[PDB]
Amino acid sequence: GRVIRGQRKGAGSVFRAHVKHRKGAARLRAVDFAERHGYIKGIVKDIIHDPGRGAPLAKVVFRDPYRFKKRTELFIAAEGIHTGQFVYCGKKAQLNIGNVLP
Amino acid sequence: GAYKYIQELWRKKQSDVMRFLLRVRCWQYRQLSALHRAPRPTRPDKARRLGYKAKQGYVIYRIRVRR
């Protein structure tokens, strides 16, 4: 017989995800010395809508501890997070909403 | 001659010395590419028996295939 519709989805090329207007892979900040032994502080710049996703994203800006650069990450926005809020990261970070820690 | 000793040495592949050497060499060649140039013959007496002469223009390539 003919190859069925659920079988045809694994080949791709029609059933692939529509990722043209998506803002990027939403993920946590990568673990380093600061987030492993202390905390690092960043700022929520804006909260954007990611297409094909009910959750909003937050663009959080940190500063690199080794280079004079500003690093941009896309977190998934906890409810209650506003812009201008400082988001802390690491083992010694306090326990508040929007504050990642182990 | 040393070549007769190396020849009878390679016939004891189940011995401790040869099972150490074969395992570490298999690990080393597994970390390289699928085809690359060896700088010299690994097994010189057998290369010599098969027709390798250690002079200019004789090239040795080491290669792996899937079983």
């Binding site: - | 000793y5 390679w10 010395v17 150490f20 080393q28 970390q31 390289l32 690994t42």
Partner: protein
């Protein structure tokens, strides 16, 4: 004397305070594949149980005997390509109007003369890249009663001859003024290599964990031993 405009400006290199200084990071370099491969090949010889016939090459002649051995071997170097031609000239003007003793090189020559009782001392390099070339030769020297020694460097053994590397070098015959100097070496080499071959054949190598993995078990056994050291009183 001092200028009041010369301030002292310290940098607080804490977490999140200042940008870190450009520190030494040789441990955390992503090394190339050949460097990484040879470095963790050097660790596998410490981890895996090395059989004694390969482990015996790690047991080596020490720092002061090697200099005496090479000092003796410098008097019996083979001729270069220049003295080879000069001897052919000297033979020609000898014809117009005895072999000196030299060093003998090559594992195929050394094995044959050890079998034929011609060698008086054998020097074997410790870093032969296929170890099958000389892994049988300490046993062949010990059974035929020929004194053998193991030396740091096929390169340094390859400087006695005028080549890149040499694997084994045999003293077969020496001069009469250097016979005593050779016999001085032969006694010390025989009491270290040929006499202790029963213990050489039983000494497995490697089987050593890493420092990070032995500190972890040392702390654990320290806790388990201090339990007994403190709960008894």
């Amino acid at each position: 004397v001092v200028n009041p405009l010369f301030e002292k400006r310290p940098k607080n290199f804490g977490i999140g305070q200042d940008i870190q200084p450009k520190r030494d990071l040789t441990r955390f370099v992503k090394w190339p594949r050949y460097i990484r491969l040879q470095r963790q090949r050097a660790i596998l010889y410490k981890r895996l149980k090395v059989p004694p016939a390969i482990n015996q090459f790690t047991q080596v002649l020490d720092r002061q005997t090697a200099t005496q051995l090479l000092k003796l071997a410098h008097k019996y170097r083979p001729e270069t390509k220049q003295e080879k031609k000069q001897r052919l000239l000297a033979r020609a003007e000898k014809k117009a109007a005895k072999r000196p003793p030299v060093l003998r090189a090559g594992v195929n020559t050394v094995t044959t003369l050890v079998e034929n009782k011609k060698a008086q001392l054998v020097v074997i390099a410790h870093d032969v890249d296929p170890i099958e070339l000389v892994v049988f030769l300490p046993a062949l020297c010990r059974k035929m009663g020929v004194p053998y020694c193991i030396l740091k460097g096929k390169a340094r053994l390859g400087r006695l001859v005028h080549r890149k590397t040499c694997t084994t070098v045999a003293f077969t015959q020496v001069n009469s003024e250097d016979k005593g100097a050779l016999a001085k070496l032969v006694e010390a080499i025989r009491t270290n290599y040929n006499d202790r071959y029963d213990e050489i054949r039983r000494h497995w190598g490697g089987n050593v964990l890493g420092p990070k993995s032995v500190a972890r078990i040392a702390k654990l056994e320290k806790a388990k031993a201090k339990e007994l050291a403190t709960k008894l009183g």
